Design a binder for this molecule. Structure first.
Ligand SMILES: Cc1cc(=O)oc2cc(OS(=O)(=O)O)ccc12
Ligand SMILES: Cc1cc(=O)oc2cc(OS(=O)(=O)O)ccc12
Lengths: 564, 564
């Protein structure tokens, strides 16, 4: 007799390209029963200025893969790779030439500019040549939203009518997942078929790939639709879980805790309203699940917050077609993925979670309400949002702005402060806990100060950081950036920042720059901003393969951790 | 329009039969947005002597299920069920008539006696009426073993010949998994199609469903073919993990540890022998994986033990056909699931794992070598086995028998002792650590004292318990049973015992009594022996649905623990 396997490439086994079949720019050196240790891989850069990628490989990984993991390959290229190890106390080395094949975009139509998304390197300081960024983005399907949850007909419903829709099953799009180096090169591709099939009508293979977050094992969590996953940089799918039967539409975030639980953002399916109508609620529930997929805890935001507060909601850009125009709420808006008040409408739009291990409490970003900390006791602990709209007892949880001296800062109910840089955040994203123990937010900025400005381009996003005295109920703004970069730095939606303590930078990714330039690719701008000087250390730009097709997130990933 | 969902049965949601589709004798009371605590359920007995099943339901479980788990229903019956909870400080109670459908055996041919396995209640002392036992048995497929792993041609192989076979892929049988009460009634069924498909050639759905072991959550882990799983009593598949690419043929055991990991018994695929032929090894590797499915550690027993020790290998029954006859080892036995020496043959047949938390070590049952403790450091710690055949440095590990006084006991190299009731174990099973801390074993008894006896019926199985002093290297046999019951209590293969501290019994199951009685159903014997008095508290017989078809194990399951 039959066909033999690949024969050994060097002093170990065969060198297999894309072993798990989901990551075509990876490869594996088969152990072939060799007992090695002290392993190190080096993928050599392409061209004169190509980037080298180098990393150690720990014993768990050798055992898991039964071989040496090769991450960092270029596509359709005779990659040169070097593996060093120790075998029998002798230092060993092999050099491999590893051909790869092509990256494929399986979702293309007449909107397609070309098959892959374009990179434009803009700025790369000295000492930042090694950086790698994983880009969480997507590409439109030819058919667009084609499926709906079926809901419950309301008493307002016509008699001959068919039942309605509910939840957000249309929140569904092809993934575009890759790592880019500082030369604008693809160094990693997650096969679109790994989790998604938009040609099939298998809802298990549908949704919006999101909330990709590293774990303590050097791996990543993710959510797509009605499932949550774990996977590594070799393209191995480590977990695949259906959501617990009460729940639906997991989007935006998934982060692992120190306790080995995972926090998910979902909705509640067949949620019984007070008027006795059932709906799939919209982005207003939080799950804590274990690695069995079981439900450790649940946070029902419809009973913690105020689903009737429309302070920010009514002040929104409809475009996020009818772009620019401020959002006019109506009382009879049908339930579903729509701007509105109450359960079964998009009242909350939680888009980010952070676990606070010090006090066993989650921190949350509600695009449409503000930022909050809720205890394990399901009690709100503090709020960070403009005073407008809130009633008690919530109103008393609002934080109070103060300066570096601790003296209060005077702002109105719309968030407009006086004689200060201090400002809140609006339609914000990733409200996380920096390594510093502070809170980093990406203040997208739509509906800032609870109004639309005289002109669409008058808008702007910030990186911004806050110091919060939970004891005193005060909040100090301690760092911002981007307020002065204009509409070319304004992302209305998605996006992220993250403090990088290793090089004292503030990482960021603006995911929808120029979303509203009808007919132009959308811009995903990768940034590392110097924390001390605000010097731009890295700037790189991703451009959508279709016009007006937003990006979601990016991560700063480190090979030294990818393979424990 | 459209079809409405089931309407509420009582004061909560609808009542769903077999919510997950894998456990037809279960139901779920949908929560319907009610917030309830203090939940307890009672499934009333059928007929006069019918056994009632009563249990608490924990929050996590209500949350996981979004409803109350109903377990313990009779097949095709109008089950009367009582659910009791608290809601708004007020006591609540509902009574439900839950109709159920039929249990199906999907694997029937002309060997079939009837479709389901028959039960015979023999003894049930008072105060033991409530017991439930999960029976882990199996039923022949029409085609039998139809698949093989492909191996590597050895140097003696004919030049024109096709490549050989390897590993143990033909270890393949449909499951028969049910819970039985002391009235002989089935009170739970795990749908055969849950893990197995024997008509389809998807090797992902093949194997031998075994090693069902409770977890710290009251769920169960289990292995079949090339995957390992976790499920619960509602039939929810909590985990489904492919084996790590290095390994194959998971059988016999899977046990979770206090550290979240899971121990598995596997073989090695593409194991490069010293002679450089690649084989899949047979039942001689131990994995420690985590719930991401990654290899945390591994024991290659072909380097830890003596794969050439044949003292027991040569003294075994061929029937385990050519039954009764003693096994005659040929050096040229083709690599595979065949009795013999070396990597690639069944030199070890490990069939139990115990984790010793006290020192981070594992205890293993090797059917063909004995019982050994290996350390985290991969060093053998002690061996419990007859002394014949062991070379240094292994022989110096053997435990030395002693009486109740610590006086040495005299045994010859074959395990046969003088003037004491102490005996060794032979082709044994489930060497686990009792709640007392002691070592319980199912001494199957084949090849006892390293020979076949004069007459075939001259065989017997023991329940047996040992106390070990590791510091001193001495083992004391401290409890036994089954020695007097003869060949009618003899199980040549499989089987299990576990000490039950709660009613001070020794639980036992004999999976293969009368296996060789040609034309006769094989007897699986559920036994509870009073520990102090050696009185039979429970004894129930399970008869195979085809002649000459072994059972594997049973578990004493507690509903009070099923839904935490
Ligand atoms: C895909 C998409 C289209 C759109 O027009 O509005 C969005 C708003 C979003 O908010 S966020 O989840 O807070 O980033 C996310 C994604 C979208
Ligand atoms: C099905 C079967 C037939 C047989 O004759 O030998 C076995 C040995 C087995 O391992 S053990 O449980 O450790 O004995 C398991 C199953 C079988």
């Amino acid at each position: 007799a039959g066909f033999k396997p690949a024969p050994p490439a060097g002093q170990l086994g065969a060198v297999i390209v894309d072993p798990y079949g989901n990551a075509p720019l990876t490869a594996l050196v088969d152990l072939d029963s060799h007992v090695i240790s002290d392993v190190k891989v080096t993928v050599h850069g392409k061209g004169e200025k190509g980037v080298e990628i180098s990393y150690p490989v720990g014993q768990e990984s050798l055992k898991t893969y039964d071989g040496v993991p090769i991450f960092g390959l270029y596509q359709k290229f005779a990659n040169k790779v070097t593996v060093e190890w120790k075998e029998n106390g002798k230092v060993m080395k092999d050099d491999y030439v590893v051909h790869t094949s092509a990256i494929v975009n399986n979702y293309m139509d007449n909107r397609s500019i070309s098959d892959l998304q374009q990179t434009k390197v803009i700025k790369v300081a000295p000492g930042f040549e090694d950086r790698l960024y994983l880009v969480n983005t997507h590409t439109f399907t030819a058919q667009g939203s084609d499926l709906h949850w079926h809901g419950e007909k309301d008493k307002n419903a016509g008699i001959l009518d068919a039942g309605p829709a509910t939840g957000a099953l249309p929140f569904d799009i092809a993934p575009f997942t890759f790592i880019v180096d500082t030369e604008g090169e693809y160094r990693w591709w997650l096969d679109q078929d790994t989790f998604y099939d938009g040609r099939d009508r298998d809802i298990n293979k549908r949704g919006y790939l999101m909330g990709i977050r590293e774990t303590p094992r050097g791996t990543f969590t993710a959510v797509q639709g009605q499932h949550w996953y774990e996977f590594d940089m070799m393209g191995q799918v480590l977990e695949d879980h259906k959501l617990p039967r009460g729940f639906a539409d997991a989007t935006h975030e998934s982060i692992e805790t120190p306790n080995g639980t995972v926090l998910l953002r979902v909705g509640k399916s067949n949620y019984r309203r007070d008027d006795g109508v059932h709906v799939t609620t919209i982005r207003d529930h939080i799950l804590e699940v274990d690695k069995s997929g079981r439900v450790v805890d649940v946070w029902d935001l419809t009973k913690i917050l105020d689903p009737k507060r429309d302070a920010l909601l009514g002040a929104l850009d409809a475009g996020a077609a009818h772009a620019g125009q401020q959002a006019k709420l109506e009382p009879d808006t049908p339930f579903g993925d729509a701007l509105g008040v109450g359960p079964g409408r998009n009242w909350a739009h939680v888009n980010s979670i952070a676990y606070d291990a010090k006090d066993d409490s989650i921190i949350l970003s509600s695009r449409h309400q503000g930022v909050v900390k809720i205890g394990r006791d399901k009690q709100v602990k503090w709020i960070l949002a403009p005073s407008k709209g809130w009633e008690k007892p919530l109103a008393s949880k609002l934080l109070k702005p103060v300066d570096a001296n601790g003296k209060p800062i005077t702002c109105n109910e719309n968030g407009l402060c006086e004689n200060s840089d201090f400002d809140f955040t609006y339609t914000q994203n990733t409200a996380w806990i920096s390594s510093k123990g502070t809170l980093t937010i990406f203040d997208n900025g739509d509906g800032r100060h609870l109004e639309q400005p005289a002109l669409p381009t008058m808008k702007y996003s910030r990186f911004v950081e806050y110091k919060i005295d939970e004891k005193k109920g005060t909040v100090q703004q301690v760092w911002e950036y981007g307020k002065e970069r204009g509409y070319d730095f304004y992302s209305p939606i998605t996006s992220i920042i993250e403090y990088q303590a290793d090089r004292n930078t503030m990482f960021g990714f603006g995911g929808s720059i120029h979303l509203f330039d009808v007919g132009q690719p959308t811009v995903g701008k990768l940034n590392e901003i110097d924390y001390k000087t605000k010097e731009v250390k890295v700037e790189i730009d991703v451009l959508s393969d279709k016009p007006n097709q937003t990006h979601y997130r990016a991560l700063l990933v480190r090979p030294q951790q990818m393979f424990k």
